[PDB]
Symmetry: none
Subunit: 98 residues, 3 copies
Amino acid sequence: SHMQPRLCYLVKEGGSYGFSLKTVQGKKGVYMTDITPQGVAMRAGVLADDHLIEVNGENVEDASHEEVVEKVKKSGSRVMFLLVDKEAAGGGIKITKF
Amino acid sequence: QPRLCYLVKGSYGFSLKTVYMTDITPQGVAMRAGVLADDHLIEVNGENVEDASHEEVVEKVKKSGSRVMFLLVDIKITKF
Amino acid sequence: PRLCYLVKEGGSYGFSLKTVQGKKGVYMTDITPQGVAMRAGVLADDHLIEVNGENVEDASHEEVVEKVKKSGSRVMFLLVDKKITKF
């Protein structure tokens, strides 16, 4: 659930990075999904429903699905992501103990 | 196994539930089109709706108006 | 709908209140195992409808916190627990 993002460096192997990018209804930017077991992404620390903040140092928080795909395709055989998890990417939560 | 159902309305006598059939009104058009409770919608008017949302499938049915066909059985994603 | 009458044990009721950005309502969370709230039948993600007979459906996190604080060592909740289109 952390407010400490992950830096994940992926090198393509066997023709695939082992992730898919999706959009989510009424949410900005793009998200990881379909993290293949033992694939490059899972091995690099990528998590399902991670939210992409940066691709190779470039902010993608406000980018379209297509923009991010292009950015990742332009990267070729290696790519770096700055990622925050599903819980960080959700709406803020206030909790008071009683 | 899949059935083709062609419904002519001014109501159809079924409800969509999340997509699935439900509220099949006794002796109505959907019931007598062959529609059964909890049918899974595979297609509407030839278009697959297996991965469709509730809203998407609702608008597709409203869009064909007074007549509709279902194939029944009793978001962007890019892969890298 | 459950009506729950809670009495503090060791200075705690064994629940926390939660609100989420984008979501209307105040909710129960963090129900301490075998605490007061758990023993009164309170459930995680219960939506608060009333506190001591005042509706709090439109109320802020902080309004509801104060309302619970103000009844002291006992408090009552009205609670409810956490698509079809016709053609």
